[model samples]
Target: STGSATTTPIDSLDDAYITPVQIGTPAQTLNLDFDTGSSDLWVFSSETTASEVDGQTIYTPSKSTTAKLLSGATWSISYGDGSSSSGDVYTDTVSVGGLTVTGQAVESAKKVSSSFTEDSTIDGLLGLAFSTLNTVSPTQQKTFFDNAKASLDSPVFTADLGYHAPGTYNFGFIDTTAYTGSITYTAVSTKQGFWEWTSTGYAVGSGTFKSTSIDGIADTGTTLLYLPATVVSAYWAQVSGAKSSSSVGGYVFPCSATLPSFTFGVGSARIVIPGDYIDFGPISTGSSSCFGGIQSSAGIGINIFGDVALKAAFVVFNGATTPTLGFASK
Candidate 1:
């Protein structure tokens, strides 16, 4: 029988926190983080020390009738932020929403540090991003998607954000109704699964003024919008009261009235970022202001249209079918 699952939206403030999904017949639930940045489905186990599992969810292996640890292998993952976690590999009957994938690869952390240990709201992470960067080795294992693909009715998956709520990162089979038409796809470069693109130019206030042509990458992993110095200056120039302050070292503007909307042209696609997304966080320096989402990471080689820009649009990173990246409206 065909079934459907609904995702609970997660808030941005909650960071990477995701709701726990019950596993096996008796059902053991654990909170997890859904990460597109990496590919691997892992959860902490009860064997972890209280200090390592503090504020994090722990999966009770004893509660599962089908849990089995995979011997002869150790797993370790390190993120760009310098945060790392080490664990042992295991297989279990795992289910998320209403979908179930039997004998799935799960990593149980043996050591977790402050960066991970502080987040009690998160128990584990579900890597829904892609399988290309999957930590699972060839001789020993397959990725969650690799194992779960056949069981899934559709080849598509969707992630819905709840903007800092309890269950913001919801995942399941894709809903065609949620999308308008076929996704526009772009070929993925040799850089694993990171989607890359070039920009025509940037505009402020409904394409009123255009800035110098620029090129960059869009990443679902980052939170802030990174831009070049020239583009940043050009955008703030249009905002009446906008000023260049070292407080944030970017563009800080008053949150007084209707902020200007910005758009970035990517090939044939035009991504429009709302003013609210531009003005991130509360004002701290001189006035009750906020930094424009677009900031100067000038010397950083490339610009990144992070989650602030991604959440406003529907992104599809097609790996299995072809090496391509696609985008659509929500």
Candidate 2:
């Protein structure tokens, strides 16, 4: 059993990646953000408040013959950025690409935060993290990957997230043509319900590699790369006029500053993020100060290797017993 899907960045800044998913009996299609940082297949639905609805698609379970309410079940999720949603649960026939998962838990949103309501590109989020992170009360539900892993050729899914373009997600198998060289495998810690791994080390541009363990999660849902303050400062220092702006809430530099590439280790592989990827965007229209894609995770408690880092290489989320993560240059 195998399946694959194409995920595209919704905005020029690559804020989030969207993938089409088929839900219910008649196969209603909705574009959802495939987020690896959380575990909840939540969507905007008929149950949501009318006032909260914007230009987003809504899933009407009543229209699907295969949709069944999961009585007494409810779920709520709050993200680091403060965006949140909560809703009732249902079991429905859901499919991604060509892979089908009957009885997949579909959380229908009853209430959503302003951030979610304002974003018209994504209807909901498809959580790819472990089911242990599910926010459902009474009885938790399995993620789509968790329920489909058993039938897959291998208990794994791969993320090929792109920058301002379309990328590929593969289930049950790895596409050899999608990456280069060999994949470097590393152990993963699922205790936190994330794809957590300790990076072997890091390097700033063409500088020497700093041999230190940096613990972080590979989160597709997050849009920026967050490392320790020490590493972030070191990288920013290389830029001629870069400064840590308290007002801007991140490191900002002159638009003309020469941004250096960033590199992190996975086993023996050194995955390099191009310099252009680090120059996130301007602080405001007509502003000369540019925000950095990499920032300090000190305030975040846990470090996150988000899309900024993930887009530089191919990532594999192995769900096998004693799960592991694999990285390869693309």
lDDT per residue (tens digit) for residues 210-325 in model 2: 98999999999999999999999999999998989999999999998878999999977899999988887889988999999999999999999999999999998989999999
User: Model 2: what TM-score?
Assistant: 0.99
TM-scores for all predictions: 0.78, 0.99
* Best lDDT among the predictions, by candidate number: 2
Give the worst 10-residue stretch by lDDT in candidate 1: 162-171
How far residue 278's Cα lies from its native spot in candidate 1, in Å, is: 3.0
lDDT of 1 at 238: 73
**Model 2 global lDDT (CA atoms, 0 to 1):** 0.94
**Of the candidates shown, which would achieve the greatest TM-score relative to the real structure?**
2
Indicate the residue-level lDDT of 167 in model 2: 97
Please give the TM-score that candidate 1 achieves against the real structure: 0.78
lDDT (tens digit, per residue) of candidate 1 on 1-330:
122343333354323435567765577787666566666676778767667777555777767788887776567777655677777877888777666788887888777667777766667777755556666553345555556665555454454443333323223345555545455555555365445566667777776546455655556455567888877777787777788777566677776746667787655566677776676655654556766676776756667766666665666544455545566655
